Design a protein around this motif. Structure first.
Motif, short mmCIF file in Angstrom:
data_model
loop_
_atom_site.label_atom_id
_atom_site.label_comp_id
_atom_site.label_asym_id
_atom_site.label_seq_id
_atom_site.Cartn_x
_atom_site.Cartn_y
_atom_site.Cartn_z
N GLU A 23 40.98 -61.80 36.61
CA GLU A 23 40.36 -61.20 35.53
C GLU A 23 38.96 -60.60 35.92
O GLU A 23 38.15 -61.45 36.46
N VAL A 24 38.64 -59.49 35.31
CA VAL A 24 37.41 -58.77 35.39
C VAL A 24 36.81 -58.80 33.84
O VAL A 24 37.56 -58.28 33.19
N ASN A 25 35.65 -59.32 33.57
CA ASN A 25 35.11 -59.09 32.44
C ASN A 25 34.37 -57.75 32.33
O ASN A 25 33.06 -57.99 32.88
N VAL A 26 34.78 -56.76 31.89
CA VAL A 26 34.15 -55.43 31.77
C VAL A 26 32.60 -55.58 31.41
O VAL A 26 31.58 -55.02 32.15
N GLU A 27 32.39 -56.11 30.18
CA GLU A 27 31.14 -56.02 29.58
C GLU A 27 30.14 -56.78 30.56
O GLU A 27 29.05 -56.67 30.75
N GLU A 28 30.74 -58.17 31.34
CA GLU A 28 29.77 -58.71 32.13
C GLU A 28 29.42 -57.77 33.34
O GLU A 28 28.24 -58.03 33.73
N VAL A 29 30.36 -57.52 33.95
CA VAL A 29 29.88 -56.57 35.07
C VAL A 29 29.06 -55.56 34.72
O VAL A 29 27.93 -55.39 35.62
N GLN A 30 29.20 -54.76 33.74
CA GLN A 30 28.30 -53.62 33.32
C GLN A 30 27.08 -54.32 33.15
O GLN A 30 26.19 -53.51 33.53
N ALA A 31 26.83 -55.33 32.42
CA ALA A 31 25.59 -55.76 32.01
C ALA A 31 24.86 -56.25 33.38
O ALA A 31 23.69 -55.81 33.51
N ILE A 32 25.46 -56.49 34.55
CA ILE A 32 24.91 -57.28 35.60
C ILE A 32 24.25 -55.77 36.39
O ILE A 32 23.40 -55.77 37.06
N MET A 33 25.35 -55.20 36.47
CA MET A 33 25.09 -53.69 37.12
C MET A 33 23.52 -53.16 36.46
O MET A 33 22.85 -52.74 37.24
N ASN A 67 35.75 -50.64 45.49
CA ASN A 67 35.12 -49.65 46.48
C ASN A 67 33.52 -49.62 45.84
O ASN A 67 33.79 -49.38 44.67
N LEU A 68 32.65 -49.87 46.32
CA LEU A 68 31.38 -49.49 46.05
C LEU A 68 30.81 -48.25 46.70
O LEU A 68 30.71 -48.38 48.05
N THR A 85 42.87 -42.90 38.18
CA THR A 85 43.79 -43.56 39.06
C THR A 85 44.24 -45.01 38.62
O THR A 85 44.24 -45.82 39.41
N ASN A 86 44.15 -45.18 37.20
CA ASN A 86 44.41 -46.51 36.65
C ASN A 86 43.58 -47.82 37.21
O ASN A 86 43.91 -49.02 36.99
N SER A 87 42.30 -47.27 37.50
CA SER A 87 41.16 -48.50 37.96
C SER A 87 40.23 -48.53 36.78
O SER A 87 40.08 -47.76 36.01
N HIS A 88 39.51 -49.70 36.87
CA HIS A 88 38.32 -49.82 36.21
C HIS A 88 37.19 -48.75 37.13
O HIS A 88 37.25 -49.10 38.20
N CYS A 89 36.38 -48.38 36.21
CA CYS A 89 35.34 -47.46 36.83
C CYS A 89 33.93 -47.41 36.59
O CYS A 89 33.70 -47.35 34.99
N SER A 149 23.99 -41.98 42.07
CA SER A 149 24.61 -42.94 41.02
C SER A 149 25.42 -43.74 41.98
O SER A 149 25.57 -43.70 43.14
N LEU A 150 25.64 -45.08 41.37
CA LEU A 150 26.56 -46.06 42.19
C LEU A 150 27.71 -46.38 41.44
O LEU A 150 27.45 -46.56 40.27
N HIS A 151 28.81 -46.20 42.06
CA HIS A 151 30.15 -46.34 41.45
C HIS A 151 30.91 -47.45 41.99
O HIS A 151 30.98 -47.41 43.16
N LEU A 152 31.42 -48.41 41.06
CA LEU A 152 32.35 -49.16 41.41
C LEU A 152 33.65 -48.93 41.10
O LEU A 152 33.87 -48.90 39.72
N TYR A 153 34.71 -48.76 41.92
CA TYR A 153 36.15 -48.60 41.36
C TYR A 153 37.03 -49.67 41.93
O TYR A 153 37.05 -50.21 42.94
N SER A 154 37.65 -50.31 40.90
CA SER A 154 38.60 -51.46 41.00
C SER A 154 39.98 -51.49 40.31
O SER A 154 40.01 -51.09 39.14
#
Ligand code: FE2
Length: 186
Positions: A23-33, A67-68, A85-89, A149-154
């Motif tokens: 599981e990935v908590n989107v709002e948690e990742v976003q806040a830390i980034m 990918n970062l 392509t169906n990923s978190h971005c 910009s810094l992009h993270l795709y998962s």
């Protein structure tokens, strides 16, 4: 209470932990980034620009989970309208400002594409998109200054679709890297 990375290295370490599980908590990742304060001394080795188009510069492969990468936007550079392509971005500003335009998905009949949202991403802001949110285009707001910009795709992906704003028709596009780990590609 948001864990604040003091360095890009710190952020990468945290991202490895946050994407290690199922599981990935989107709002948690976003806040830390967003909490990482962009420091050009830490990412200049990835900031390789091109005169005519933006560049994609791979930073980290996240143990296969993501990918970062860092994207360098020259004066006036922008993207196509594209999907993910169906990923978190996740997209975080490191320098300058990008305008993000969110588009509705086309249907089968040819038509001008429909804007759903338009905003400027601020200093250090982290935005998020996936295919259920919409399509988007991003572009450097400035014709005199770059953006970075810094992009993270998962999960990682190497192809997406570009869309014609006039018709909605799409074409498959293979993503290529300008550099990897600070080293120019062929
Ligand atoms: Fe995108």
């Amino acid at each position: 209470e948001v864990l604040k990375p003091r360095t890009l290295a710190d952020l990468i370490r945290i991202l490895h932990q946050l994407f290690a599980g199922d599981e990935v908590n989107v709002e948690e990742v976003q806040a830390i980034m967003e909490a990482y304060e962009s420091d050009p001394t830490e990412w200049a080795m990835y900031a390789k620009f091109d005169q005519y188009r933006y560049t994609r510069n791979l930073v980290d492969q996240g143990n296969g989970k993501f990918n970062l990468m860092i994207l360098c936007w020259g004066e006036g550079h922008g993207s196509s309208i594209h999907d993910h392509t169906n990923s978190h971005c996740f997209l975080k500003m490191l320098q300058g400002n990008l305008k993000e335009t969110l588009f509705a998905w086309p249907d089968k009949k040819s038509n001008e594409m429909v804007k759903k949202s338009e905003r400027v991403l601020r200093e250090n802001q982290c935005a998020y998109i996936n295919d259920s949110v919409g399509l988007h285009r991003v572009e450097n707001i400035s014709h005199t200054e770059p953006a970075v910009s810094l992009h993270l795709y998962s999960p990682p992906f190497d192809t997406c679709h570009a869309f014609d704003q006039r018709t909605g028709h799409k074409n498959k596009v293979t993503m290529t890297f300008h550099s990897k780990f600070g080293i120019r590609t062929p």
